[PDB]
Ligand binder design. Structure first.
Ligand code: HEM
Ligand code: HEM
Ligand SMILES: C[C@H](O)[C@H](O)[C@H]1CNc2nc(N)[nH]c(=O)c2N1
Ligand SMILES: C[C@H](O)[C@H](O)[C@H]1CNc2nc(N)[nH]c(=O)c2N1
Ligand SMILES: N=C(NO)NCCC[C@H](N)C(=O)O
Ligand SMILES: N=C(NO)NCCC[C@H](N)C(=O)O
Ligand SMILES: [Zn+2]
Lengths: 411, 413
């Protein structure tokens, strides 16, 4: 039951007891490990145990476990589910829940910051125009002129499943992708489907390479509506290299604010289907993945050519050399414009310190090694040498289907 | 479940695994916890042994298209009677070869498996003494080295009987460098081998006490106390490491050996346990250039290289570690290629592996693979394996960990 994890660099061993609190499942079995697979309404009876589980942890956290206040609240919530088939979180509960969903996020390397999350309560929102206003305020607060601050905005919880709030966008800020007559993709290929959805809904696409997508927002189960984020709220950084003057001529830029907007927040059985959240970038996210994935901007060959590397044979490591340079450029560009960014060395070192804190004060830290180890220079970061246990605690952030696959278009 | 899909996220190819239904052994994972990043998670009686033997011979006979034949049926009968009367059994030479090839085929952590069908198997089951093991191992080294044109090979010593007469190679690899803890707390040579080096010295080895001393072989035959032997220097091929552009690189004084030969694993075939089964292929460059040279708890050369490169080391965000890492790895590949010693870069190796894996799904129904081990320790996502979902499970015949023998050996004195 009590599991040990070893760091093979430092020989430090930690003991995990926290995994014994996971109710949810991993996709693995005793015979098969699915650790590398990307993706392996509640009835009344379903809901009270989940609410109770949550309220017990909440009341424990504030040192009032078993108190009258604790028991009073369970009964109140119990009576509310019984009567209304659902319930409403107190503001203190919502804030605790969202922070803990971040705390429990096994794939997030930035969790040392978890207790500092700014939670914006948008549960009073009723319309798409209201959603747009809440989202601009989030973008402006979080961006903070380049001195980024973590934040989440929480729209109304699911009820009957036919009045869901959703941000159709996968992040608040992303670039369009356009399939071309000549077979190629212009822009970001990751966003081709969603861009088409915007167009057929009305968007007049500019048809460039770095077109900030419009917001497509769904309130109360209604058909979604298009809105443009004030251009002046979208902070971008042009990418240059401190040594190569030709780099700026590649014409590359990226946006400062990473804001995942397609996930579902579960707190105490309640489901928050629209819950955009933001932090700040780790450099490799943009320089390794967004820029060098073959299926993304796929820029390695172009960069390698401008560096005049020998690209006749893989064993010259021309791909590897170009990769480091692209990532050097990304960090230098964000730092020079005073936009918060963390490099993979600093971020992984912080995470190892966070793990140790969590093991000491909480009995463990769920971590997905496949996601925590950066996509370049893996073994020269400390996380590579750290064994991790992956398990699922709630409150949690969950994947959910894209809404265009399930939306019944009212028309 | 009968069908499991894996997806490649860069190509959108989906593959269907059915081979996992033949998995027997357990992973360490459960419905509630994944242990996929744990390095090591968690004799046989007659009753245990016959099904394991039968399972294996059905696999063997099926492979040669003689399943259910009289040949097949007689062999089952023969093994059953052999187990009944002697409590163990002996493999035919053909079955041993098949078994050893399949253990490699089945090794989830090995990126080199496109080569599995070409293993040279050396049958050393007539061996009885440590001196005999030494001679077998010298022959393996000379054959596998092949003057730099490396050939994959495995030498198989007698199987376990009662667990009191085990053959063991105490070395973790046939060729490895000594490590010495100094009184000031520093390490001379390879810190990975300090404990084994101390054991060798205790048993009588006169250590040169340098930075790259080839360790002696420490060999246990038939449960007896192990004995020391020096591999003839002329059979140990080494490569001095230089850089194609940086002429100061050579003056770091680095070299490595050409033949990687894991010697501490256990090979299971049809329930039988082969506790001494050294095997060798050829290096992928990152094993040396990233791990052996640049791990903090190994030779740890990153700073020295970066200093000589005049990189800005004041802040991690210059990516000075990363820039130095690439150059060290360019140097390892350049040096081996220049001396005409087989080596493979991590791009070539991972590309070959994806082709192998796809072929295996199609002809075999699956390819168990450990993503944590398969993805190289630098430049992960610019290799195709990073983007490939994998399924990890345990098929037999198999290579398994076993505890270091100094922890278990009963000293006879
Ligand atoms: C504050 C700075 C933050 C940093 C440096 C950071 C770092 C990261 C990185 C590098 C990833 C991998 C992303 C990818 O590969 O696509 C990730 C994933 C994730 N993070 Fe964070 N993060 C931060 C803030 C947050 C916040 C504020 C939340 C929630 C409140 C959060 C929750 C998550 C979740 C759920 C994932 C997995 C997302 C997925 O499955 O696609 N993170 N984080
Ligand atoms: C012929 C060329 C080969 C290449 C390029 C290759 C490549 C590799 C690499 C890079 C690793 C990771 C090693 C580490 O990180 O320490 C590995 C692991 C492994 N390989 Fe191979 N290999 C080859 C031959 C072989 C052979 C001949 C066998 C057995 C007959 C084999 C079986 C294994 C096993 C069992 C592991 C896991 C070892 C462990 O857990 O420490 N490989 N291979
Ligand atoms: C197939 C494999 O799961 C996939 O490529 C994963 C690998 N590790 C990851 N790690 C992070 N942080 N983000 C990702 O998108 C990926 N994708
Ligand atoms: C903790 C983690 O499992 C450990 O550092 C693993 C990571 N992946 C690996 N991959 C390979 N090929 N070899 C290794 O030794 C490691 N070690
Ligand atoms: N650092 C964060 N969030 O705080 N990342 C969110 C996912 C962003 C995604 N990896 C990208 O490169 O666009
Ligand atoms: N490629 C192989 N075998 O053929 N590797 C075996 C392990 C070698 C180990 N990684 C080292 O760097 O010494
Ligand atoms: Zn698993």
């Amino acid at each position: 039951r009590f599991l040990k994890v070893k760091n093979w660099e430092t020989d430090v061993v930690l003991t995990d007891t926290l995994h014994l609190k996971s109710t949810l499942e991993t996709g693995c079995t005793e015979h098969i490990c699915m650790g590398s697979i990307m993706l392996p309404v509640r009835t009344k009876d379903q809901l009270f145990p989940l609410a109770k589980e949550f309220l017990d942890q909440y009341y424990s956290s504030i040192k009032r476990f078993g108190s009258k206040a604790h028991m009073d609240r369970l009964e109140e919530v119990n009576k509310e589910i019984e009567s209304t088939s659902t319930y409403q979180l107190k503001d203190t509960e919502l804030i605790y829940g969202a922070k803990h969903a971040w705390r429990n996020a096994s794939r997030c390397v930035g969790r040392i910051q978890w207790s500092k999350l700014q939670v914006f309560d948008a549960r009073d929102c009723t319309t798409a125009h209201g959603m747009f206003n809440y989202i601009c305020n989030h973008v402006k607060y979080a961006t903070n002129k380049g001195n980024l601050r973590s934040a989440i905005t929480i729209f109304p919880q699911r009820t009957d499943g036919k009045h869901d709030f959703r941000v159709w966008n996968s992040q608040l800020i992303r670039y369009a992708g356009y399939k071309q007559p000549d077979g190629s993709t212009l822009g970001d290929p990751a966003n081709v489907q969603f861009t088409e959805i915007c167009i057929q809904q009305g968007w007049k696409a500019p048809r460039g390479r770095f077109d900030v997508l419009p917001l497509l927002l769904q309130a109360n189960g209604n058909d979604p509506e298009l809105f443009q984020i004030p251009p002046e709220l979208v902070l971008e950084v042009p990418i240059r290299h401190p040594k190569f003057d030709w780099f700026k001529d590649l014409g590359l830029k990226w946006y400062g604010l990473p804001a995942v907007s397609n996930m579902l927040l579960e707190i105490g059985g309640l489901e928050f289907s629209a819950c955009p959240f933001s932090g700040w970038y780790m450099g490799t996210e943009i320089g390794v993945r967004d820029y060098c994935d073959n299926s993304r901007y796929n820029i390695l060959e172009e960069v390698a050519k401008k560096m005049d590397l020998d690209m006749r044979k893989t064993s010259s490591l021309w791909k590897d050399q170009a990769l480091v340079e692209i990532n050097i450029a990304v960090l230098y560009s964000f730092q020079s414009d005073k936009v918060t960014i963390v490099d993979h060395h600093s971020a992984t070192e912080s995470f190892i310190k966070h793990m140790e804190n969590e093991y000491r004060c909480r009995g463990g830290c769920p971590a997905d090694w496949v996601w925590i180890v950066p996509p370049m220079s893996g073994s020269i970061t400390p996380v590579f040498h750290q064994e991790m246990l992956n398990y699922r605690l709630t409150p949690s952030f969950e994947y959910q289907p894209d809404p265009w696959n399930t939306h019944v278009w009212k028309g």
